[PDB]
Amino acid sequence: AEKPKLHYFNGRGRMESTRWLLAAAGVEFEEKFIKSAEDLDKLRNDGYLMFQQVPMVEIDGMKLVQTRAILNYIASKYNLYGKDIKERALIDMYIEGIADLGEMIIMLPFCPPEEKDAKLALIKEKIKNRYFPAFEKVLKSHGQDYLVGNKLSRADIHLVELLYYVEELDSSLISSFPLLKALKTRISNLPTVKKFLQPGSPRKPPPDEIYVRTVYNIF
Amino acid sequence: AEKPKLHYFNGRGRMESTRWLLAAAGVEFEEKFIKSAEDLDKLRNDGYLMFQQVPMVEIDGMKLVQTRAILNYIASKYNLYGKDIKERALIDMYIEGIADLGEMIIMLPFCPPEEKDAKLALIKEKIKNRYFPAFEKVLKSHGQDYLVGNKLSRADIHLVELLYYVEELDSSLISSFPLLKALKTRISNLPTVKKFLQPGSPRKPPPDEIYVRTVYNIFRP
Numbered sequence: 442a443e444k445p446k447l448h449y450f451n452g453r454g455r456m457e458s459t460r461w462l463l464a465a466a467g468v469e470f471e472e473k474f475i476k477s478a479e480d481l482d483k484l485r486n487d488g489y490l491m492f493q494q495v496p497m498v499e500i501d502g503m504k505l506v507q508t509r510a511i512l513n514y515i516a517s518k519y520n521l522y523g524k525d526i527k528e529r530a531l532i533d534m535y536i537e538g539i540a541d542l543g544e545m546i547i548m549l550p551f552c553p554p555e556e557k558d559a560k561l562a563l564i565k566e567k568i569k570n571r572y573f574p575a576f577e578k579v580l581k582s583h584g585q586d587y588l589v590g591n592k593l594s595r596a597d598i599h600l601v602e603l604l605y606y607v608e609e610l611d612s613s614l615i616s617s618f619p620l621l622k623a624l625k626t627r628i629s630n631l632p633t634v635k636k637f638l639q640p641g642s643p644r645k646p647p648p649d650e651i652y653v654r655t656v657y658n659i660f
Numbered sequence: 661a662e663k664p665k666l667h668y669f670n671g672r673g674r675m676e677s678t679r680w681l682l683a684a685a686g687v688e689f690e691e692k693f694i695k696s697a698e699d700l701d702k703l704r705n706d707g708y709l710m711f712q713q714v715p716m717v718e719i720d721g722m723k724l725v726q727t728r729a730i731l732n733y734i735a736s737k738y739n740l741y742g743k744d745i746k747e748r749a750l751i752d753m754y755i756e757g758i759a760d761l762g763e764m765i766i767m768l769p770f771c772p773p774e775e776k777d778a779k780l781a782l783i784k785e786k787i788k789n790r791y792f793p794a795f796e797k798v799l800k801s802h803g804q805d806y807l808v809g810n811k812l813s814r815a816d817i818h819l820v821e822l823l824y825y826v827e828e829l830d831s832s833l834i835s836s837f838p839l840l841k842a843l844k845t846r847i848s849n850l851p852t853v854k855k856f857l858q859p860g861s862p863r864k865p866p867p868d869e870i871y872v873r874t875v876y877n878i879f880r881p
């Protein structure tokens with residue numbers, strides 16, 4: 442059985458939460474980068490893409506598409522999805538809030554220039570008034586090092602990845618949230634995450650204008 | 661002890677897939693309809709909405725927000741989430757396709773009249789050229805009555821809900837997809853689903869301009 446092989450553009454977009462989770466889990470993977478519309482159309486025409494889209498991951502005999510299908514499978518396989526049905530409800534609730542905020546961040550570079558200020562201001566408002574208070578409250582309420590079950594789960598990994606993007610956006614947004622600051626440091630120091638955070642890993646950068654244009658070209 | 665209680669507007673939107681799944685699982689539930697901004701504020705103020713949003717379901721002593729958290733819990737509890745990690749992977753892939761389509765459909769009534777025509781045209785095109793082909797191909801690959809593991813799962817339920825909606829929208833779209841038609845018929849005839857499909861059940865109508873205006877009136881009174 443192979444290393445999982447990740448099909449996506451050479452950028453963050455919709456594959457980056459899978460790169461984080463696999464790296465957090467200590468799992469070696471390979472990437473086949475889509476550089477053109479022709480690369481994508483060949484995957485489609487070869488029947489690799491159930492819904493004609495990427496992300497797609499080749500893992501344990503499957504060609505899985507859909508971010509959540511990929512991540513649930515990885516989380517479940519590497520015991521990062523809790524130990525029972527009630528922990529999974531907490532985990533799902535948390536990571537779905539993270540996905541919603543995440544989505545706004547992923548979509549942001551693609552919005553018309555005249556809308557950016559308004560959209561960014563709204564993401565900053567939701568971070569401050571909605572999402573950071575929600576997660577700080579979880580940490581504050583049980584006083585434990587991990588969001589759920591007193592042990593590392595995907596929710597920790599997904600949230601910390603998000604705290605890194607929020608820092609790139611505005612380093613002060615986290616300032617009033619000391620338990621989130623502390624979660625970020627703790628998880629960043631786990632050997633697997635520490636290595637993924639270091640130069641030269643598969644961690645992808647923020648999108649620049651050449652990438653924004655390229656992603657269009659790939660559609 | 662208590663029935664699940666579903667906190668939403670009195671219409672489909674983001675709660676309908678849950679009404680379908682619970683009914684398919686044989687679970688009677690209650691609904692508490694949010695009618696005003698006051699009602700929404702009370703749920704928030706009581707601290708029952710983790711991200712200040714609905715849907716919310718009170719089930720088994722918990723208050724579950726996020727549509728997918730709600731559905732995953734229900735599907736796991738009532739054995740509609742396949743039998744192993746690999747079946748769940750197939751289930752999740754299939755149903756996330758449905759969710760992408762669903763998300764366009766649910767937002768359609770709150771589009772400006774100017775974007776509506778094109779949005780609808782796009783929806784139909786994706787049904788016909790992307791999603792119905794994908795699901796037909798899966799049913800054809802194995803010739804079995806159910807999408808995954810040759811037994812009823814949440815994927816069948818969520819697909820068939822989608823097929824009922826697509827029928828309302830344009831009843832010709834399914835015409836080229838004989839295996840989807842057959843699945844729709846089989847699943848519709850299962851005791852629990854048949855009961856949910858009957859007149860007078862909790863199944864909700866398609867949204868009308870009053871539902872739309874109630875939703876706006878709640879978020880922007």
Ligand SMILES: N[C@@H](CCC(=O)N[C@@H](CS)C(=O)NCC(=O)O)C(=O)O
Nearest residue numbers: 454455493494495496507508509760
């Ligand atoms: N719900 C899907 C969304 C995938 C998606 O939007 N994919 C884009 C690339 S980021 C794509 O393949 N676009 C081509 C298309 O939709 O026609 C997932 O989470 O994987």
Ligand SMILES: N[C@@H](CCC(=O)N[C@@H](CS)C(=O)NCC(=O)O)C(=O)O
Nearest residue numbers: 541674712713714715725726727728
């Ligand atoms: N990802 C969430 C989205 C929920 C959502 O957007 N709910 C809307 C109403 S249908 C809401 O409460 N909006 C008010 C707000 O976001 O302030 C889910 O699937 O439950």
